[PDB]
């Protein structure tokens, strides 16, 4: 077993491991598109010769609270051959990529987890929450207060690329969890909008000046419309799009993977009709440089100036001062007032998890309940954290 | 149709309407127990003579943020005969009970809703969130950080009444959503802990000095344990009880109806094992007296002093000043800065819903985004809102 | 194997065979009640000594077209021990009972069939059709034309026996398929109206001056109400009862076993909401005396006088003259114009099956298509055929 | 919103609305084939410019009782964009098409309804009944009386087009509900007989001189054969085809969408094996010209001459005389003896619904029960009403 950056010769072997590892494998053509996001030394392979392990990262741009955009290393295409389990190959590959990511000057790494029990030990914490809502649209009536009681157009996605790009670009800069979507990923998205023989049905779009929804009828449940993506920049756009989706009179049910603070339920006279059918971790974060990440994001202006000493387990100890919505984070050997593993800081960082909830599980440790309330308020996001697109 | 306080003669007719209206009807013996919580003029019937409509309220004590206990009118046993639908009987009965509740000096009314689309128009807003977690305990491993790596005892519920009463009494005074559980409801709870021929299996309890869990094996799914109630006063107690439940080696799955901030997921090495299988509105609140309710609860000390003008639709307009965790709420004819229906204030009141989320649905209306952030922070609860027991 | 009328000593052995043969066995107490309807020589047993075969008939009164009530032998409690299959015991028992029934002067025998492939060969034809309608009552709206836009009362069945008896007695005399329901069967019906530990839920009744509905919530599907029986003497009563059932706001679905001409679908703005979920043969008829049965019923006055020659396979050949809604049916050796097996005549007799449909299957054989149209019209019932109660 | 006849330029926009509206959308190539049945001014669009509403009719030939063929306007391709619900677009489009259909001289319009609650208010009544039978062929044995105890050939559909056309043409002229099937619809039918990658399996045909059956194995249930179409001109052909289908020894079940008077059950020794698994409205009729439609069909010769006065709600009042199987229908201001909405007359017109059943729902109103019996008999069809093909 040797750990190397792959040569062009290695990629057929990587596509074999990928096809055998990922049931949702996009195939070599699509994989080659995504490859354009992987920097020169962004990939590692293990050879036994045949490829028995692989991992890479892509150059991403992640929005964090305060509309701050961080360069982010997006881990992806991580696989160990079923022949080479329990030989420390994942640990070796993650250690090497983290070395390269830290040396390259990324303050943050991110991934989508295949299972929930794997990445905590490598310092990734779940930082966004996926929330599936299923609406029985047959009963759905809009509240008298709901905006916009036609601004929306039913269109072919492939004919309005420019408009979706412009709306998404405005959305991703305003929302924590937002990711820059490069041209190659717009190519890939509009390719999956087409009907496939034996596969997905045709996708349609609802287009508003300030929002869009991409949806298709389920392959097998012909009374279910699945919203693949809804991006709205204004409340008027969000409501108008949902009025149009609830107008899909041939459907019984509309489903969407959204975030816990989606206002959809409050648009209806019966909030219970917007049923939570599924909940899971979305984006995971590893804070690579604690002071860089903590100084870079904005904090709630509602909390008054405070100082503390934060220790990250094997991540350093810092004098952390938060005031006027900004943090200063400097080295100190003073006694820690707060201790947590690196994964816990990732979970706190976009505002998806409360310091108080993590403290109740003893993942976050302080003797000061006032400090806990101050951290909770400071790390909270004004704009609710959302998940952009899986990678 | 005449609307009257029922005589003793009316109660057999009320029990008939109840049996026909409520599939979960506890029966006349249990109903007579709960009746001891209904004050002298706490009930209305409609006669056509036979009972075709009924509604009552019980005298409750509800904990709100700041550990403040409010006298609360708990609406219950609300039914219209299937023969007398669409004749305004619900509206007539609710109007009369609200008159009596307001005149009696209750600042707040509360209920559990049979359907989500009914009580908004009578000024009730959903104020707590039920969250069902299902744990596949076969895979569950506790995190190295989790407390208490034996303080817990497996016991017969009927033999440790005193201990459950004492623990519950400590829990309900500390948690917003907490309700005083009178002696008659402890009688009823321990009666439902017994096995029934053709019905529920025997209930067992796990007892800690600072917490308890009541559970039973599902009637039909013999690999599922259903936790009917877990009350823990400390994090050590919460973790210790979950270590014991995960030790139910004959079960595949443990389910509990809990709240969105339950720390259980963070106790495990795989947070995904604590799956959200169901989410619904719990307790609904109608604010009867706006200034009394707003002055009575505690507010977050993290937000700096601020003043605004709040208008409740047909509920009055108030100068609202919040500072040092207290509110002053006085009559004013000054221009409104914030407007909302009465139901919306109920949804905000225990901290379960953010002002910002309601604003995004246009249920809450202001031109000031800074005011919105201040309301969000002020109305937030330090201790997460939980649901006590259904009534 | 000897075939005998049973002595009192035989009945414990008959109750053992019954319990082993009938999963719906009502038990010895209920069986003893129904026994009061079995005349002195109304039962046969086969002994091998232990009971290995049994069959009996009850004295019934059946309404046929023209509101004519026929003495009817109701076959029931027919069983062969699983140890004694394929030994001709059913054929021997049926032959003996038919001998006794014919000699006793019954013009007609009737039964409910355990399976569809058994009784045709003994001359029974299916004569009524069971039609299960399931209404999704959440969507159900009554048509502007529907009668009665409160005449109906929600009551305890056991408290209004007299009223149900009087309504049923009016219904059974007006409807072909109607059966006299003796006092012992009213005792049995009101006993099954009670909740059972581990069994059925409590039954309720909707009572109108000219109709009633008995219903209960399903044991396991708590959003389904099952109507066990709806008897309405007028269209106003039928509509009023359905308005009340659709008012069961806690239910998603109402199901009823009714007849193909139930007007319920036409009461709604969406006829499709009254979904046919199940269809089966109900009452089976064996015509014992062809001329007695054919002369006894009324015929459609719309068809002009006609004469034909009907041959029943091993049942005789008859000159059949139909006019002014009456038939004369006399012996003849003239050439047959119509031939059919005895079972086919049973299927025609209450108007549930058209001569033309049976002719298309070659169960009914004529060279005259005009004769076929005349038989179709003559045998049709003005009042649609319904099924009274299973026996 | 303007309502126009579409130009060629509009049809791409109509195909977009169609694809988004109809999950069973046949696609632009097939849609262009069906278009050949739409006359010059047979289509309307609503433009907001983009197509937000559409409706058309096709020139059909419908067989009614007495083997009379009526020119029929077949409404189809009716859609409102999900963006433009509740703006009266359906009402506007239906009003314009009905104007054009009436002015063009069509006595009748027809459609297949997407939902049951929509078309009643525009004067369409359900006029045929779809009845799905599922046969467990493993148990199926033919009755000793059943015809034809080999006349049938297993063939490739595409090789025997001429024979299917000739048989169908004989069937459609003899059966009420029969439609002329133009060459373009035979092209489309034989195209759907081919296997599709990820779609339907290959279709086979059973061919008799006087009947055919088209069938295929279900996509997912490989023990179910689905009969798409069985057309038999004689009882011998019907029985012979069913003997062949019951010979599909690799299948457990055969399903067919047929009519309520299908003789299949009576061909078997166990009639219960032909299970009704589904029942729904088929063809809907709007009578455009009451006297033209009522004079055009044949009536039962069994009923003696009678006269009445029929009022159709906003459809005129007529002296209706029926005798010798013919109707004369003339204007009158005499008192109405019978009143009904236009939709009700459509439901009566092919004989699928009895006047007596509609009267019991108060959709048909008379004080004369003798008149009701006479209408029932007169409007009855000698040959049972069937459904030809959906459009
Ligand atoms: O495979 C990937 C990225 C996963 C895409 N992708 C998987 C599932 C989806 C949904 C369904 C969304 C995102 C890749 C990355 C880099 C590379 F060089 C080659 C391939
Ligand atoms: O019926 C009630 C209260 C519902 C009890 N109860 C229903 C479901 C449960 C669970 C399952 C929990 C609470 C009542 C109230 C007042 C009165 F005077 C008579 C009866
Ligand atoms: O068992 C019977 C009659 C079946 C009752 N019964 C079965 C099912 C039911 C439903 C469910 C309705 C009717 C009998 C008859 C005569 C006798 F002497 C003893 C017993
Ligand atoms: O789309 C249609 C007619 C529906 C075909 N079609 C739908 C379902 C099927 C089955 C499955 C049978 C009939 C049309 C009509 C006119 C036009 F100009 C363009 C298209
Ligand atoms: Cl912020
Ligand atoms: Cl999201
Ligand atoms: Cl607080
Ligand atoms: Cl809770
Ligand atoms: Cl009659
Ligand atoms: Cl019936
Ligand atoms: Cl005819
Ligand atoms: Cl048909
Ligand atoms: Na923002
Ligand atoms: Na690409
Ligand atoms: Na993924
Ligand atoms: Na507290
Ligand atoms: Na009690
Ligand atoms: Na409840
Ligand atoms: Na009658
Ligand atoms: Na009895
Ligand atoms: Na039975
Ligand atoms: Na014909
Ligand atoms: Na074609
Ligand atoms: Na169709």
Curated annotation (Swiss-Prot), chains A, B, C, D:
Database matches in InterPro entries: Acetyltransf_17, Acetyltransferase_Eis, Acyl_CoA_acyltransferase, Eis_dom, GNAT_dom, NAcTrfase_Eis, SCP2_sterol-bd_dom_sf
UniProt note on regulation of activity: Is potently inhibited by several small-molecules that share an isothiazole S,S-dioxide heterocyclic core. Some of these inhibitors, when used in combination with KAN against resistant M.tuberculosis, efficiently overcome Eis-mediated KAN resistance by restoring the antibacterial activity of KAN. Some of these compounds also inhibit in vitro acetylation of DNA-binding protein HupB.
Active site, UniProt feature: 119, 391
Effect seen on changing residue 281 to A: Nearly abolishes catalytic activity on AG substrates
Disruption phenotype annotation: No significant difference in terms of intracellular survival in U-397 macrophages and in an in vivo mouse aerosol model of infection. A strain lacking this gene induces more TNF-alpha but less IL-10 production in primary human monocytes than wild-type. Macrophages infected with a M.tuberculosis eis-deletion mutant display markedly increased accumulation of massive autophagic vacuoles and formation of autophagosomes in vitro and in vivo.
Primary localization class, coarse: secreted
PROSITE patterns, per the entry: GNAT
Transmembrane segments annotated in the record for this chain: none
GO cellular component, one term: host cell cytoplasmic vesicle
Entry keyword set: Acyltransferase, Antibiotic resistance, Host cytoplasmic vesicle, Secreted, Transferase
Residues binding acetyl-CoA, per UniProt: 78-80, 86-91, 114-115
Compartment list: Secreted; Host cytoplasmic vesicle, Host phagosome; Extracellular vesicle, Bacterial extracellular vesicle; Host extracellular space
First-tier enzyme category under EC: transferase
NCBIfam families listed in its UniProt record: PRK01346.1-1, PRK01346.1-4
Other comments on record: Increased expression of eis due to point mutations in the promoter region of eis is responsible for resistance to the second-line injectable drug kanamycin in a number of M.tuberculosis clinical isolates, through acetylation of its amino groups, which leads to inactivation of the drug.
Membership in a protein family: Belongs to the acetyltransferase Eis family.
Subunit structure comment from the entry: Homohexamer; trimer of dimers.
Name assigned to this protein: N-acetyltransferase Eis
Organism: Mycobacterium tuberculosis (strain ATCC 25618 / H37Rv)
Primary gene name: eis
């Amino acid at each position: 077993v040797t750990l190397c950056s792959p040569t062009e010769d290695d990629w057929p072997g990587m596509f074999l491991l990928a096809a055998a590892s990922f049931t949702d494998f996009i195939g070599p053509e699509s994989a080659t598109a995504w490859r354009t996001l992987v920097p020169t030394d962004g990939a590692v392979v293990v050879r036994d010769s045949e490829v028995v392990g692989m991992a890479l990262y892509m150059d991403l741009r992640l929005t964090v609270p305060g509309e701050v955009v961080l360069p982010t290393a997006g881990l992806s295409f991580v696989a160990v051959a079923p022949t080479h389990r329990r030989r420390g190959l994942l640990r070796a590959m993650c250690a090497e990529l983290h070395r390269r990511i830290a040396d390259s000057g990324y303050p943050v790494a991110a991934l989508h987890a295949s299972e929930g029990g794997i990445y905590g030990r490598f310092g990734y914490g779940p930082a966004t929450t996926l929330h599936e809502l299923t609406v029985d649209r047959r009963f759905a009536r809009f509240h008298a207060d709901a905006p916009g009681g036609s601004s929306v157009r039913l269109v072919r996605p492939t004919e309005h690329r420019g408009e979706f790009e412009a709306i998404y670009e405005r959305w991703r800069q305003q929302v924590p969890g937002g990711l820059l979507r490069p041209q190659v990923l717009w190519d890939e998205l509009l390719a999956e909008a087409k009907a496939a023989p034996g596969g997905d049905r045709e996708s349609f779009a609802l287009l508003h000046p300030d929002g869009y929804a991409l949806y298709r009828v389920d392959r097998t449940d012909l009374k279910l419309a699945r919203v693949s993506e809804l991006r709205a920049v204004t409340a008027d756009a969000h409501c108008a799009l949902w009025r149009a989706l609830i107008g899909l009179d041939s459907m019984e049910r509309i489903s969407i993977i959204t975030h816990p603070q989606d206002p959809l339920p409050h648009l209806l006279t019966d909030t219970r009709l917007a049923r939570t059918t599924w909940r899971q971790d979305g984006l995971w974060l590893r804070i690579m440089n604690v002071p860089a990440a903590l100084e870079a994001r904005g904090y709630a202006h509602e909390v008054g100036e405070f100082s503390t000493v934060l220790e990250v387990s094997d991540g350093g100890r810092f004098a952390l001062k938060i005031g006027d919505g900004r943090a200063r984070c400097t080295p100190t050997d003073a006694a820690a007032e707060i201790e947590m593993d690196r994964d816990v800081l990732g979970s706190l960082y976009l505002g998806a998890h409360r310091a108080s909830t993590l403290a109740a599980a003893n993942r976050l440790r302080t003797k000061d309940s006032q400090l806990l309330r101050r951290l909770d308020a400071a790390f909270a996001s004004d704009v609710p954290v959302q998940t952009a697109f899986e990678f």
